[PDB]
């Protein structure tokens, strides 16, 4: 029931549309207005769209929601462009836990990570195909030998 | 070339003067030849007395690769920290030397106290002993002392000390030489690229 609800699979279609049933399933009833995703839809691009909305609808009051959601959008865009680097899914999961209930000032972000955590839970393979490049945030400064962390 | 007259240490006669020899009243070609001969013998016969202090003495012995008496020495190299308990000793040894005498300060400590601005250290030997050449470094490379000796030779070849203690002016005229820093400013500033600190 909404863009801020956790995705469920075909197995959860036999669950009654009640607040307790969907909650135990691992999501929320929300507005009870469900949306169906077909096999021709990529989960990474779908969640990227969801995050782009949740990220720009932020009011900018608390850091977790104001600076954390924009990070996820960039990771998801990199994954859908095949430019993902190792550690991206872990950051996404850490964001989902640290933008959860209680951490943010209101429930915009707690509900914004609900679709993301679910997509990684049931369709991780789609998020993994994105990581195709080695991790690198540093260029090579000439004259300075780099600290080779192993 | 201007000269500094030390007629007859922290406070003493230091009048800036003109080449006493060039002055016509005391201008004699023979006297000039005599001055040059004495300066030549002194600059080419600088016997040293290395007062070993702290770690600089170790670099000095590497350069060495002896006037054990201050009496036979013409140069006292202060190489080390001027500790409070050592300062009286340094002054006594320098005061047991005969004219002409020179002093080269080797090391940041002997130069100004260096990294040891502490209660037990004199901030520079130039606080009690007149110095002629200062060698920056900690410790200064053995080759740096050799450069200092060559700089002293040049300064000694331009001095106008009394030719005899019974006649003439008994004044030590030391030339106001050009600072080495300004002399080699051009080449230093021209430097553009250097080897990356990545290779041996
Ligand atoms: S979680 Fe709520 S209060 Fe915090 S930035 Fe988002 S909209 Fe603003
Ligand atoms: S200047 Fe440096 S190396 Fe030389 S004696 Fe002092 S501390 Fe030691």
Swiss-Prot record, chain A:
It comes from the Bacteria. Signal peptide: none annotated. [4Fe-4S] cluster binds at residues 59, 62, 65, 106. Belongs to the complex I 51 kDa subunit family. Composed of 13 different subunits. Subunits NuoCD, E, F, and G constitute the peripheral sector of the complex. NDH-1 shuttles electrons from NADH, via FMN and iron-sulfur (Fe-S) centers, to quinones in the respiratory chain. The immediate electron acceptor for the enzyme in this species is believed to be ubiquinone. Couples the redox reaction to proton translocation (for every two electrons transferred, four hydrogen ions are translocated across the cytoplasmic membrane), and thus conserves the redox energy in a proton gradient. This is NADH-quinone oxidoreductase subunit F. It comes from Escherichia coli (strain K12). The chain holds residues 293 to 442 of 445 of the full protein.
UniProtKB/Swiss-Prot annotation, chain B:
[4Fe-4S] cluster binds at residues 55-56, 109, 138. Pfam families: Oxidored_q6. Its cofactor is [4Fe-4S] cluster. Its EC number is 7.1.1.-. It catalyses: a quinone + NADH + 5 H(+)(in) = a quinol + NAD(+) + 4 H(+)(out). One of its GO terms (molecular function) is NADH:ubiquinone reductase (non-electrogenic) activity. Keywords: 4Fe-4S, Cell inner membrane, Cell membrane, Iron, Iron-sulfur, Membrane, Metal-binding, NAD, Quinone, Translocase, Transport, Ubiquinone. The keyword 4Fe-4S applies. It is found in: Cell inner membrane. The keyword Magnesium does not apply. InterPro entries: NADH_UbQ_OxRdtase-like_20kDa, NADH_UQ_OxRdtase_20Kd_su. It comes from the Bacteria. Its main location: membrane. It is a peripheral membrane protein. GO terms for cellular component: membrane; NADH dehydrogenase complex; plasma membrane; respiratory chain complex I. NDH-1 shuttles electrons from NADH, via FMN and iron-sulfur (Fe-S) centers, to quinones in the respiratory chain. The immediate electron acceptor for the enzyme in this species is ubiquinone. Couples the redox reaction to proton translocation (for every two electrons transferred, four hydrogen ions are translocated across the cytoplasmic membrane), and thus conserves the redox energy in a proton gradient. HAMAP family: NDH1_NuoB (MF_01356). PANTHER family: NADH DEHYDROGENASE (PTHR11995), NADH DEHYDROGENASE [UBIQUINONE] IRON-SULFUR PROTEIN 7, MITOCHONDRIAL (PTHR11995:SF14). This is NADH-quinone oxidoreductase subunit B. It comes from Escherichia coli (strain K12).
